[PDB]
Amino acid sequence: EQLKCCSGILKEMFAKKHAAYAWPFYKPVDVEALGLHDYCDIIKHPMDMSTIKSKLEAREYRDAQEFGADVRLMFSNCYKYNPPDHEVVAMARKLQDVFEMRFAKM
Ligand SMILES: CC(C)S(=O)(=O)c1ccc2c(c1)-c1cn(C)c(=O)c3[nH]cc(c13)CN2CC1CC1
């Protein structure tokens, strides 16, 4: 099953090797603590790694493509909300490189 391959992708994205850039994506953006009160006006469908992990464990993805769409949604939200020169955008790109290289191996 390619959903076993999806659990592997998440283990890689949560690994210590990538923590320096993956950490802002581990949990939902805490809009209240960060003062990002315009976030929900710009981002219609928030997504993060812990939510993807919960969805995967709860059989909410029919296949690897549905799983992949939520991972790409997480990165697209980051690219849409932040200015392009923001530190978090560079971090999203580094994490997206980890994901895309592993996802391509299926
Ligand atoms: C529990 C945690 C995940 S957090 O939610 O406290 C948290 C803490 C800080 C943090 C994020 C989220 C953040 C995430 N993302 C997806 C965005 O698009 C952001 N734009 C701006 C920020 C974020 C501000 N910074 C990241 C900045 C240093 C590089």
Structure method: X-ray
Q: What CATH number does the domain containing 43 carry?
A: 1.20.920.10
Distance CA 38, CA 52 (A): 23
Distance CA 52, CA 5 (A): 14
**Cα torsion angle, 72, 77, 83, 89, sign:** negative
Instruction: Give the list of residues 6+ apart from residue 49 with CB closer than 8 angstroms, or none.
Output: 10, 13, 14, 22, 25, 26, 27, 74
- How would you label 32-69 residue by residue, b for 16+ Cβ within 10 Å and e otherwise? eeeeeeeeeeebeeebbbeebbeebeeeebeebeebbe
Atom of ligand 1 nearest to the CA of 48: 16
For atom 25 of ligand 1, the residue with the nearest CA is 24
What is the tally of structural domains in the chain? Answer: 1
Distance CA 66, CA 83 (A): 28
- Please report the resolution in angstroms: 1.7
Residue type at 69 in one-letter notation: A
With tokens 């994506």, the residue in question is 25
Who lines ligand 1 at CB under 6 A?
24-27, 29-30, 33-34, 78, 81-82, 87-88, 91
**The domain containing residue 63 runs over which residues?**
1-106
